[PDB]
Design a protein around this ligand. Structure first.
Ligand SMILES: OC[C@H]1O[C@H](O)[C@H](O)[C@@H](O)[C@H]1O
Ligand SMILES: OC[C@H]1O[C@H](O)[C@H](O)[C@@H](O)[C@H]1O
Ligand SMILES: [Cl-]
Ligand SMILES: [Cl-]
Lengths: 510, 510
């Protein structure tokens, strides 16, 4: 029950805890975040950071509330308040990272960065089949988009826990993979730790005792004597679930994943689910770990597969995992979350952050707003990674499509810079996408969330509303718009006339 | 709770309630059978019948106990005691049938009778696949056994609720069916009403509201407002389940079964599960029916598919459904159940009774006892139907194999008689396989369960023990052993010398 009461320093701003709550930060009076058994649909970390260089850490989950000008934190384990003498957000990040989530030195597969990614989810939804995937792939190429990592999303397999292609819809999956390789794509498969609970796979997993067991609400029943599997309700239905605490579950998962790699030439895996909330209730694990750690240990599987992507996470800061922002709606509200979510992810140790799916990644959203799709693409362009799903050529008229292609072109022109800071982030953990406050502390940027720095020297200010005008707050120094070449005096807010094609970006010259 | 309390008449014997309890009948002091929520792994009917012509019926389930010489029945609904004036078992049977389960006039597909049946369950267990099924079928013909109905058992499909062949193990199921038809076989598929509860089929059934719903233990929650499915534990795991009370579930089931017939040319279906026990607990059904009626209504699907077989049943006496004795163990005790089980099934309105599987129908029993297999085959031979699974040519030496073949030959010689009483059974409900007590009342046959009458005129007394001698109790009259042509006077017990090949059968000549 150990608790901690922290008066804010005058003017102090606090961020942390949960990536999918960044739009509610800096934490205001009234704010409440519970981490115990909740990763809020995305990545979560037991870390708060302040604009005054202060930080809070615990190895275990906590809840945080701001009442008035006081932080109240209730820890399940123990935690503490720290001050970095530098006094800035960057100092708080730097000290916290080296103490608690030091950079591993490794990168996720570089193919995830060096071209845009394509996920079949919005185009094909549940109808993942060989013919339509190949067509999507061919359409990418024919429309002049660069081949990249192609993610085949949910429903390519017979049932949950059967790690093979359903032959009804994939008559020659190896051939399909080979063709995709030929066209310059890499291929990733959606996977999860859920098992259809009346199948061969389920019975095999039950017999190997790699599932989570039902406690029967009994205080004293032990893992080693439980016989019935936990059954868990999620968005696709009801399933048994792998016990991430059980080393035999790791072996099983490897067998399945390595199988797909060897049999079909699969390059990597999109690791979905693992959300802490699925591990709550009457559940027994072999090593008696909490729901948050179940999420965390699912996350570690991706350390064995350099080409990976996670949405749900607990900890694993400083690790070579791609951390995708969760399913975004088809709204301007959501396009406005990409920067602050991404920038927060970076500070929680998730430098390799990909901003969900251009135009939105929630399938029931898919009426379509073309402008929004363009602005989504342009916002993705100079983030660490760029991910498509809905086919721009299918839903955009020709100059909206051209604008999207131009966004892709700009990313290719900036790629040496992106890759420079990406490689660096592997070594030092320092983010690729940085908030204005991280790079320009105590210069009035604490609440500027529609601008970010790509490394130290490029200020990107994507257009994220309708109109022919965009305001841009420049730090002290001189700045050169990389496209127009017009030099601007820093230290003020400027107004820029914009078209559908504009992606404001400035090089720091002084 | 309404009830009857019945003093036994002097010498009176009572049978009824549940097929799979017939070995414990006539009901002894201490006997207890609960029907409410329980069909005892097989067919059950709310009927009791006495050697003195008395009978008990209710439309609804009951419990029955004998305490000393009192037979007590406790009804969920209402019921009554009746007396047939002829004063015999057959009179009680005939009156009860005509009042409460009159013969429909119809037959199941006659191919189920006019050749031995073959079921792939014991041969292939869970590994059901095109190549091994065809090999089985070719080994049937190559060993000189007659082509029959071939039943492809559990696990031919991707998951429970997906009514299609798994293309990994059936690369050309239609072709396979065509080849089996060309060899003289017909083909049935195992089906059940369970749904893998995280799959497409599950989500479609949930959306159509054809599943059974979870009541949440609430007394007030109506079907119409429930959103979550009932999840049921069974021998293959955890599943959603169809609501048999819901007419939309009937349509869905017809769509799937008709789909299999049209696409692949499937002749019929083995309808498994449906057991009343699976319908207990926190469950809401559209027409608010009990667990027994869920079993009964699963049974009626077979009214649309003349080539059918069921194990679990509630009521539907007098109907054109094949009723299979359940999974038998590979034991002498279980071989000794075939006759009393089958004869009881006849009295409860199940004339079209097939005695499970030669040698055993429980997979986990598979030191195979060759003699036991032979005697199982011989016991099957002059029953209404004869069903193989384990390959006699794989597990028997040549004498034993020949003896099984001779059993098949005897059945073929006797088939006109079998079919005569089968066609009659459709019209009058009068069983094909009759107990000795049924044909010969008040002659001391009440507890004789190793002999049966095929129709009126053939007394069959299979060898059901080891040794060279078989006792046979002959009713008054004259009896001609059909091989030797020797005539025996009845009204006494003879001892008959037997070999492995002997199937003692006597024609009534007085
Ligand atoms: O069900 C598939 C769906 O699952 C989650 O919502 C993911 O975040 C999506 O991107 C998609 O993969
Ligand atoms: O699971 C398959 C198995 O299911 C039940 O037990 C049946 O009675 C068996 O004959 C067999 O079909
Ligand atoms: Cl969910
Ligand atoms: Cl069961």
């Amino acid at each position: 029950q150990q608790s901690l009461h922290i008066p804010l320093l005058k003017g102090e701003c606090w961020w942390g805890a949960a990536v999918n709550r960044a739009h509610d930060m800096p934490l205001q009076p009234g704010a409440f975040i519970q981490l115990n058994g909740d990763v809020s649909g995305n990545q979560a970390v037991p870390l708060l950071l302040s604009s005054a260089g202060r930080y809070v850490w615990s190895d275990q989950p906590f809840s945080v509330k701001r009442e008035g000008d006081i932080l109240s934190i209730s820890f399940t384990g123990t935690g503490a308040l720290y001050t970095a003498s530098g006094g800035s957000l960057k100092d708080a990040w730097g000290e916290a990272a080296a103490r608690f989530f030091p950079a591993s030195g490794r990168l996720p597969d570089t193919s995830l960065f060096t071209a845009p990614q394509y996920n079949t989810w919005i185009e094909l939804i549940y109808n993942q089949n060989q013919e339509d995937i190949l067509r999507y792939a061919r359409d990418i190429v024919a429309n002049g988009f660069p081949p990249g990592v192609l993610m085949i999303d949910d429903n390519w397999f017979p049932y949950y826990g059967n790690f093979s292609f359903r032959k009804d819809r994939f008559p020659d999956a190896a051939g399909m993979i080979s063709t995709l390789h030929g066209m310059g794509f890499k291929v990733m498969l959606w996977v999860c730790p859920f098992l259809s609970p009346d199948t061969e796979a389920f019975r095999e997993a039950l017999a190997k005792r790699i599932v989570l067991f039902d406690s029967k609400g009994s205080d004293t029943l032990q893992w080693q004597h439980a016989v019935d599997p936990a059954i868990v309700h999620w968005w696709n239905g009801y399933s048994a679930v792998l016990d991430g605490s059980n080393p035999d579950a790791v072996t099983w998962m490897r067998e399945k994943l390595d199988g797909l790699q060897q049999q079909y030439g699969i390059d990597g895996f999109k690791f979905d689910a693992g959300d802490a909330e699925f591990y709550l209730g009457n559940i027994l694990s072999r090593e008696k770990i909490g729901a948050n750690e179940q999420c965390e240990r699912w996350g570690r599987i991706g350390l064995l597969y350099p080409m990976n992507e996670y949405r749900a996470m607990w900890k694993n800061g400083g690790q070579p995992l791609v951390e995708r922002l969760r399913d975004k709606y088809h709204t301007w509200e959501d396009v406005r979350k990409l920067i602050p979510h991404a920038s927060l992810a970076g500070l929680l140790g998730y430098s390799f952050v990909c901003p969900d799916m251009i135009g939105g990644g929630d399938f029931s959203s898919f009426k379509l707003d073309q402008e929004l799709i363009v602005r989504s693409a342009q916002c993705h362009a100079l983030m660490p990674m760029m991910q498509f799903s809905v086919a721009p050529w299918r839903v955009l008229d020709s100059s909206q499509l051209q604008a999207v292609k131009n966004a892709v072109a700009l990313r290719r022109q900036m790629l040496p810079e992106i890759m420079k800071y990406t490689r660096e982030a592997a070594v030092t953990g320092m983010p690729v996408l940085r908030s204005m406050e991280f790079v320009f502390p105590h210069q009035g940027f604490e609440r500027v969330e529609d601008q970010f720095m790509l490394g130290d020297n490029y200020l990107v200010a994507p257009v994220l509303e309708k109109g022919s005008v965009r305001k841009i707050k420049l730090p002290k120094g001189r700045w050169q718009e990389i496209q127009s070449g017009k030099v601007y005096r820093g230290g003020e807010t400027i107004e820029l006339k914009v078209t559908l094609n504009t992606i404001p970006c400035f090089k720091r010259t002084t």
